[PDB]
Amino acid sequence: EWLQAEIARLKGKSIVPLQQVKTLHDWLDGKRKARKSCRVVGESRTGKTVACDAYRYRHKPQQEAGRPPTVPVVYIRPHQKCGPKDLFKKITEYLKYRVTKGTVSDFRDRTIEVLKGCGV
DNA sequence: GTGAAGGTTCTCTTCAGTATTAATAAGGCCACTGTTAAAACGTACTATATAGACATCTCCACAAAAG
Numbered sequence: 767e768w769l770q771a772e773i774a775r776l777k778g779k780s781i782v783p784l785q786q787v788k789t790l791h792d793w794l795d796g797k798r799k800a801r802k803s804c805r806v807v808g809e810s811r812t813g814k815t816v817a818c819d820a821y822r823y824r825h826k827p828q829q830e831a832g833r834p835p836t837v838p839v840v841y842i843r844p845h846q847k848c849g850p851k852d853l854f855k856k857i858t859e860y861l862k863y864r865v866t867k868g869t870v871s872d873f874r875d876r877t878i879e880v881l882k883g884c885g886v
Numbered sequence: 887g888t889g890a891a892g893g894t895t896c897t898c899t900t901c902a903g904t905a906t907t908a909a910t911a912a913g914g915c916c917a918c919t920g921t922t923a924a925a926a927c928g929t930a931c932t933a934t935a936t937a938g939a940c941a942t943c944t945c946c947a948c949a950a951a952a953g
C-alpha cells in the first residue's frame with residue numbers, strides 16, 4: 767500500500783541544508799583549525815543538535831593498516847547529571863574502547879591516551 | 887650368689903555416636919544515587935500607627951429707615 771510508505775517516510779527525520787547549519791559548520795571549522803574551545807547556545811528546537819550532528823557526519827573517521835582509527839571530531843551527548851567517570855565512558859565508548867574497571871583517575875588516564883591515540 | 891639380662895601375660899571393647907539454651911556481628915573499599923535534617927535566605931498578603939494639607943462654623947464688627 768502506497769499510503770504506508772509515505773506515512774513511514776513522513777514520520778522520520780531528514781536533514782535540510784539551511785544556511786544556519788552552513789554558518790555553524792564554517793565556524794566550527796575555524797575553531798577546530800585554530801584548535802579553539804568555544805560554545806554553541808540558542809533556544810530550544812532552533813536546530814543546534816541537528817547542525818552539530820550533521821557536522822560529525824561530515825568528518826567521519828579514517829583508518830590506516832595496523833593502526834587505530836583516527837576520528838577528527840567526536841560528538842557526544844551526556845546523560846543528565848553526568849559525573850566524570852560517565853563522561854570518560856561516553857568518550858571511551860564513542861572511540862570504541864572499553865574500560866571495565868578502574869578508579870575515576872584510571873578512567874581519566876585511559877581517556878587521555880585514547881583521545882591522543884585517535885588524535886581527535 | 888647378689889646382681890644383671892631377659893621372659894612372660896593381661897581377657898573383651900555390638901560400643902559410641904547422633905538432640906538443646908545459642909550470641910549484634912565479625913566486609914572493605916570505590917563510586918553512584920537518594921533520601922533526610924536543617925540551615926540559610928528571597929518577598930507577600932497583610933494590621934496597623936501615625937503626621938498634616940485642607941474645609942468648616944462661629945463670634946465680633948460696619949449702612950439704611952423711624953421717632
Ligand SMILES: Nc1ncnc2c1ncn2[C@@H]1O[C@H](COP(=O)(O)OP(=O)(O)OP(=O)(O)O)[C@@H](O)[C@H]1O
Nearest residue numbers: 780781782784787809810811812813814815816817
Ligand atoms: N537542519 C534541520 N533540518 C531538518 N530538520 C531540522 C533541522 N534542524 C532542526 N530540525 C527539526 O527541529 C527539531 C529540533 O531540532 P534539534 O534537535 O537540532 O534541536 P536543538 O536546537 O538541539 O534543541 P534543544 O536545545 O531543545 O535540545 C529536529 O528534531 C527536527 O525535527
Ligand SMILES: [Mg+2]
Nearest residue numbers: 813814815816
Ligand atoms: Mg539539542
